[PDB]
Amino acid sequence: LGEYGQRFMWLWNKIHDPANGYFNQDGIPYHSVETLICEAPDYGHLTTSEAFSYYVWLEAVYGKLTGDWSKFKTAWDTLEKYMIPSAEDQPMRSYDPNKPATYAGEWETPDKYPSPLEFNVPVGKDPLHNELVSTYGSTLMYGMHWLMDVDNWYGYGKRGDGVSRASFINTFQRGPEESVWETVPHPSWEEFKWGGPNGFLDLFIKDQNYSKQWRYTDAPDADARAIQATYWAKVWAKEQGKFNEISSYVAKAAKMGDYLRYAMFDKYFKPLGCQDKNAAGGTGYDSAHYLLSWYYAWGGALDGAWSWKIGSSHVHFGYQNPMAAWALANDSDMKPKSPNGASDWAKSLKRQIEFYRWLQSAEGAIAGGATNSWNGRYEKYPAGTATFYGMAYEPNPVYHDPGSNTWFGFQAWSMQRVAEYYYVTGDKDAGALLEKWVSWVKSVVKLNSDGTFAIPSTLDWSGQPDTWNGAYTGNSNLHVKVVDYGTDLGITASLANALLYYSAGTKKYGVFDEGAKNLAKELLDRMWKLYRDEKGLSAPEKRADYKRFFEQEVYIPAGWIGKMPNGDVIKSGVKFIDIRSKYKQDPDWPKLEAAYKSGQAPEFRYHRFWAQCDIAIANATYEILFG
Numbered sequence: 001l002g003e004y005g006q007r008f009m010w011l012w013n014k015i016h017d018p019a020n021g022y023f024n025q026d027g028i029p030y031h032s033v034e035t036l037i038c039e040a041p042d043y044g045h046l047t048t049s050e051a052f053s054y055y056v057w058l059e060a061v062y063g064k065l066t067g068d069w070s071k072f073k074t075a076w077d078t079l080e081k082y083m084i085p086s087a088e089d090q091p092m093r094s095y096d097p098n099k100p101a102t103y104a105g106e107w108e109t110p111d112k113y114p115s116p117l118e119f120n121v122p123v124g125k126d127p128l129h130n131e132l133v134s135t136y137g138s139t140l141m142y143g144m145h146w147l148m149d150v151d152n153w154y155g156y157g158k159r160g161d162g163v164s165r166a167s168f169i170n171t172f173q174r175g176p177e178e179s180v181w182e183t184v185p186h187p188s189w190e191e192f193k194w195g196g197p198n199g200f201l202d203l204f205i206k207d208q209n210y211s212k213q214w215r216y217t218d219a220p221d222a223d224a225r226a227i228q229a230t231y232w233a234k235v236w237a238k239e240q241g242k243f244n245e246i247s248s249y250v251a252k253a254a255k256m257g258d259y260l261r262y263a264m265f266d267k268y269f270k271p272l273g274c275q276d277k278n279a280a281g282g283t284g285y286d287s288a289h290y291l292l293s294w295y296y297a298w299g300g301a302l303d304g305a306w307s308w309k310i311g312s313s314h315v316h317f318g319y320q321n322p323m324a325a326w327a328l329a330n331d332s333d334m335k336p337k338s339p340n341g342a343s344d345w346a347k348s349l350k351r352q353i354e355f356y357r358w359l360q361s362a363e364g365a366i367a368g369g370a371t372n373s374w375n376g377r378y379e380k381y382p383a384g385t386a387t388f389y390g391m392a393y394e395p396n397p398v399y400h401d402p403g404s405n406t407w408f409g410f411q412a413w414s415m416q417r418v419a420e421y422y423y424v425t426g427d428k429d430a431g432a433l434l435e436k437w438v439s440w441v442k443s444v445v446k447l448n449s450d451g452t453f454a455i456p457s458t459l460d461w462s463g464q465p466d467t468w469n470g471a472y473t474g475n476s477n478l479h480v481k482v483v484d485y486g487t488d489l490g491i492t493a494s495l496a497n498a499l500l501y502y503s504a505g506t507k508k509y510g511v512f513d514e515g516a517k518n519l520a521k522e523l524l525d526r527m528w529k530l531y532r533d534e535k536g537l538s539a540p541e542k543r544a545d546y547k548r549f550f551e552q553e554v555y556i557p558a559g560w561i562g563k564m565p566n567g568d569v570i571k572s573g574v575k576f577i578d579i580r581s582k583y584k585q586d587p588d589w590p591k592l593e594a595a596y597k598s599g600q601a602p603e604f605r606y607h608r609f610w611a612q613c614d615i616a617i618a619n620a621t622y623e624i625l626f627g
Contacts, residue, residue, distance in 0.1 A: 002623045002627040003623075004524075004619045004620065004622040004623040004627060005065050005619075005620060005623040005627065007524075007528065007616075007619040007620075008061065008062075008065060008616045008617075008619050008620035008623070009065070011536055011537070011612060011615060011616040011619070012058065012062060012616055014535055014536040014612070015058070015536065015609075015612055015613070015616070020033060020534075020535040020536070020607075021033050021535075022535075022607070022609055022612070024045070024150050024151055024165065025165075026078070026082065026165060026166065027074070027078050028047060028078060028082055028148070028150050028165075028166060029047060029051045029052065029054075029055050029609045030044060030045045030046070030047055030051070030150055030609060031043075031044050031045070031046055031047050031048060031051055031608065031609060031610075032044040032606055032607055032608045032609060033535055033606075033607040033609075034588065034604065034606055034607065035586055035587070035588070036583070036586045036587075036588035036589065036591075036592060036604075037604070037606060037608075038180055038181070038545075038546070038548075038549070039180060040180060041147065041180075042171065042180050042181075042183070042185065042576075042580070043153055043154075043580075043583075045150050045151055045153060046147060046148060046149055046150060046153070046169075047147075047148050047150050047609075048146055048147060048148070048219070048222065049083055049144035049145065049146045049147075049218070049219045049222035049223065049226075050146075050219060050221070050222045050225070050610055051609045051610055052075075052078075052079045052083050052144060052222070052226070053144075053222045053223070053225035053226040053229065054225070054609060054610040054613040054614070055075045055078075055079070055609070055613070056072065056075045056076060056079065056225075056226050056229045056230065056233075057225065057226075057228070057229035057232075057613060057617060058075075058613045058616060058617065059071040059072040059074075059075045059233075060072055060229045060230070060232050060233040060236065061232075061616065061617050061620045061621075061624075063233060063236055063237065063246075064232070064236040064620070064624060065620055065623070067240055067242070069233070069237060069242060069245060069246050072233050072246065072249065073245075073246065073249060076230075076249045076252060079144070079226070080252065082148070082166045083144045083145065083148060084142060084143065084144055084145070085140075085141070085145055085168065085188075085214075085216050087138075087140055088159070089159065089168065089189070089214065089216075090140060090141060090214060090216065090298070090300065091214075091300065091302075091304060092139040092140075092141075092298070092300045092304070092307045093139065093300070093304040093307065094300075094301075094304055094305060094306050094307055095129060095139065095300075095307045095308075095309070097125055097126040097127075097129040097130060098125055099123060100123060100124075100125070100126040100129075100268075100269060100308060100309050100310070101123055101268060101308040101309060101310050102117050102118075102119060102121075102123065102308070103117070103118050103119075103121035103123055103268050103277070104116065104117050104118060104205055105118065105277075105376060105377040106175050106176070106373070106375065106376020106377060107174075107175050107376070108175060108176070108177060108375070109175065109177045109555075110174040110175060110177060110178045110182055110555040111555045112175070113173070113174040113175065113203065113204060113555075114202055114203060114204055114205055114206040114557075115204070115205055115206065116205075116206040116207075117205060117206065117207050118277075120278075121268075121277050121278065122270075122278070122279065122280050122281040123268040123269060123270075123281050124266070124268065124269025124270055124271070124280075124281030124282030124283070124286075124287045125269060125281065125282060125283055125284060125287075126265075126269060126309060127284040127285060128261055128262060128265075129309070131338050131339065131340060132258065132259065132338060135258070135337050135338040135339070136255070136258075136337070141216075141259055141262075141298050141309075142252075142255045142256050142258070142259045143216075143218040143223055143256060143259050143260060143262075143296070144218060144219070144222060144223055144226070144256075145168050145188060145216040145217065145218070146170075146217050146218060146219035146222065146295075147168075147169055147170055147171065147217075148166060148167065148168060148169070149166075149167040149168075149169045150165060150166060150167075151165055152164060152165050152167050153582065154167065154169060154185055154564070154565060155564070155565030155566055156169060156186075156187035156189075156193075156194065156565055158189075159189045160187065160189050160191040160193050162193070162565060167187070168187065168188035168189060168216065169185055169186065169187055169188060170185075170186060170187075170188055170215075170217060171183035171184070171185050171186075173203070173204040174203075174204065174555070175376070176376075176398060176399050176400045176401070177400055177401050178401070179399075179401040179402075179548075179552075181548040181549075181552040181554075181576050182401075182552060182554055182555065182576075183554070184200060184203055184554065184556075184570065184579065185564075185579075185580075186199070186200035186203075187199075187200075188214060188215060188216055189214045190212055190213050190214065190215075191212050191302070192212060193565075194562070194563060194564065194565050195562040195563070195570065196560055196561060196562035196570075198210035199212075200562070201213075202560070203556070203557070203560065211301050211302070211303075211305070212301070212302040212303075213299055213300060213301050213302055214299060214300055214302065215297060215298065215299030215300075216297065216298060216299070217295050217296075217297040218260075218262070218263065218295055218296045218297065219295065220260060220263035220292040220293060220294070220295065220296065220319055221292060221318065221319040221321070221413075223256055223257075223260050223263075224260065224292055224319075224320075224321035224324040224325075225321065225324070226253065226256060227253045227256060227257050227260070227321075227324040227327065227328065227334075228321055228323045228324040228327070228417060228420070230249065230250055230252070230253035230334075231253070231323065231324065231327040231331065231334060233246055233249070233250070234246065234250045234331070234333055234334065238333075243333075247333075250333055250334065253334065254328070254334055254335060254336050254337065254341075255336070255337065257324070257328040257334070257336050257341065257345065258336035258337060258338050258341045260292075260296075261341065261344050261345075262296035262298075262309065262311055263291075263292050263293050263295070263296045263311060263312065264288050264289060264290050264291060264292070264293070264311065264344065264348060265287055265288050265289070265293075265296075265311030265312075266282065266287040266288075266289065266311055266312075266313050266372050266373070267310050267311055267312050267313040267372075267373060268281065268310065268313075269281055269282045269287040269311065270282060270287055270313070270372065270373070270378060271286045271287055271390075272286065272287065272288075272289060272372055272389055272390035272391060273372070273387070273389070273390020273391065274372070274378060274390075275374065275378060275379065275380045275381060276378055276380070277377055277378035277379070279378070287311075288344075289315060289351070289370075289372060289389065289391060290344070290347045290348045290350075290351035290352075291315045291319075291320065291348065291351055291352060291355055292315070292319040292320050292321060292348075292352070293311055293312035293313070293314060293315045293319070294312045294314045294315070294316060294319065294397065294398050295310075295311075295312045296309070296310065296311050296312065297309070297310050298310075313371055313372040313373030313376070313378075314369070314370075314371050314373070314376075314394070314397045314398045315355070315369045315370050315371070315391070315397060316368060316369040316397045316398065316404055316405065316410070317355065317356060317359050317366045317367070317368065317369050317405075317410065317414055318369075318404075318405070318409075318410030318411075318413060318414045319414070320352045320355060320356065320414055320417070320418075321352075321414075321417045322349055322352050322353055322356075322417055322418055322421040322430065323417045323418075323420040323421045323424070324417070325345050325346075325348045325349035325352055326349050326421055326424065326425060328341070328342060328345040329342050329343075329345040329346035329348075329349050330342075330346070351389070353418075353427070353429050353430060353433070354388075354468065354470070355369075355370075355388065356414075356418060356433055357429060357432075357433050357472045358388050358465055358468040358472075359465060360433060360436060360437070360465075360472065360475060360478075361440075361461075361465075361475055361478045361479060361480045362474065362475055362476050362477070362478055362479055363440050363443075363479065363480050364436040364437045364438075364439055364440025364441075364480075365411060365437070365440055365459065365480035366410075366411060366414065366415065366437065367393070367395060367405065367461060367465065367478055367480070368393075368394055368395045368396050368397050368403075368404060368405035368461070369393075369394055369397040369405070370387075370388050370391035370392060370393055370394055370397070371391060371392050371394050371397060372390070372391045372392075374392055385464075386464040386465050386466060386467045386468075387467050387468065388467075388468045389468070393464050393465060395461040396461075405459065405461065406458050406459050406460065406483075407458070407459070408455065408456040408457055408458065408459055408482075408488075408491065409488065409490075409491045409494070411437075411441075411456075411459075411495070412491045412494035412495040412497075412498055413491075413494055415434065415437055415498045416494050416495075416497050416498035416501065418430055418433065418434060418498075419434055419497075419498045419499075419500075419501030419502045419505065420501050422434055422501070422502065422505045422509075423501045423502075423504050423505040423508065423625075426505065426508065426509040431505065431506075431509065431510065432472070433472075434502045434505075435502075435513075438499065438502050438513065438516050440480075441495065441499065441519075442515065442516075442519060444456055444482055445495070445519065445523075446485060447519075447522060447526075451526055451529065451530070452487075452526065452530065453487070453492075453522075453523060453526050453527070454485035454486060454487060455485065455486065455487070455488065455491060455492050455495060455523075456482040456484075456485060456486075457483075457484050457485055457486030457488060458482075458483040458484045459480055459481065459482060459483060460480075460481045460483050461478075461479065461480060461481070462478075462479045462481070463477040463478045463479050464477060464478055465478045486541070487531075487539040487541075488539075488541075488611075489527060489531060489537055489538070489539050489611055489614075489615060490608055490610055490611025490612075490613075490614045490615065491611075491614070492523055492527060493523075493524065493527070493611075493614040493615040493617070493618035493619075494614045494618065495520075495523065496519075496520035496521075496523040496524050496618045496621075496622075497520070497614070497617060497618040497621050499516045499517070499519055499520035500516075500517060500520045500618070500621050500622055500625050500626070501621070501625070502516055503516035503517040503520070503625075504517075504625040504626070517626065520618075520622070521622060524618055524619055524622060527615075528619075533605065535607045536607050536612045536615070537607075537612065537615055538605035538606055538607055539605065540603050540604070540605055541603065541604055541605075541606065542601035542602065542603050542604075543601060543602055543603075543604060544601035546592060546595075546596070546601070546602050547596055548576060549575075549576055549577050549583070549592065549596070550575060550576075550577060550596060551575070552575060552576045553573065553574070553575060554574050554575065554576060554578075554579065556570060556571055556572045556573075556574060557572070558572055559572075560572070564579055564580075566581065566582055568580070568581050588604075
């Protein structure tokens, strides 16, 4: 009804209007309407578990503002149907929780891959498997695979069929210096139909022999977001007296949360702080860091001979979700069906909040995270390394090209979740954390006299937090610096959103931070005045990095020779574009070429699905909290 609710409805309609092309013919949201884009997915009509979780969240807000929950239901329907691997996609058997996987190291550059399996390295015990099978009577892992080829652009299809839409693929497999430009896109379902003699397997892992197999990789931040979204769909549906029709879907979130516990464990279930790849594996929860790590992954032979599961040793603050954790731990409607599910999430909630606080810089921004596997090989931490429950501080977990915490976006995305958690519970630690972070946000966000604005785009870091001992020290030697500014509309909105939940919480529990509200509303207003266009909102952005289309060599081993489904040859010396020749048919290919040849950065007005969702949600959030 209100102005900001009206704003949500307007953008929601732009998003769902088929003329604008946000979804494919099966109703799967693309990463973006535009196809020529490269940043995490390397093609715009791929999609991510991230996009799906935002789709669910968008429709949850629709339901609050509308009373109509069909939107939210069909979003979850599409999610489960397409993005979660079905029983035939992940036909797991012969799993050994006492030998969950076999170790391989991580390496500094892509040219050091394939990484050899090291069979003497002890791997710990998986304490979740038996519990989940007992609870659900199934070996199906209920989590989203992170990357999908929506309209079969790459040509691998569904389960090696080479034709079907909604094709599971993966890219990143070769360490922290493998940028989005340096991957070899390959099917999750490996039958040796494409690539080289052993498919794409021997680009990534070196083994004595190779088997046809499947494997998937979860993005825990996306799954948690879907759960967070469902929590609000739940409270909002119960408020309206329509819990029951959405109660099937709250159970989906609870089950997803139950399996999302795999993200809480070390990659190879090694004890926290072990610092030795030859150290004995964990017995149970001694290998749990209780945080949302970069991934969990699972795979198996096509014939069911063997299977494996891994957590991740790398944790980024940007992935954490105290709202989702609190909901799973404490909300009886959201309670996971397993005996220990809720209890583990209660531990995770507490550990997560400590983690945020430990990482809070002198200024207020949150630093990157930590690892239980130094250099991805369980190596000895350098002298003077700051630690968190035995895990070593890392300014940029997992990726260094570019650094994973040089993106300001994680500040907004992650602290937005903390803000919701604070608004809900009034947790003092969360409040204190937010208070300092919001103070920082105010000192750096730019409100220009002309009506424009800019938020931090790139960050840089120096120093370390103090070693964690259960109390925030102030971390006087840990420093953030804002390198440059931009007008990223998705993040701008997420930031405004976070500010509104904090501000609302302060009204409820402490002294009303009206300044946080005013700054947020300003951002949403200035952006609404400037950046509306025919498919939603967009701000011009240059992509000087797109010279890597033409200039980035993809590492392929000497003598390794293979093919992509369209016929592109994969060999030593190939460029990014050489194994993706269908890009030359893209409507925007002329524009890219023009810019590249004239030595200038190509400019785009993108409509990223998640960005448009964040925008809608942030405006609707003002209405919900202050309307």
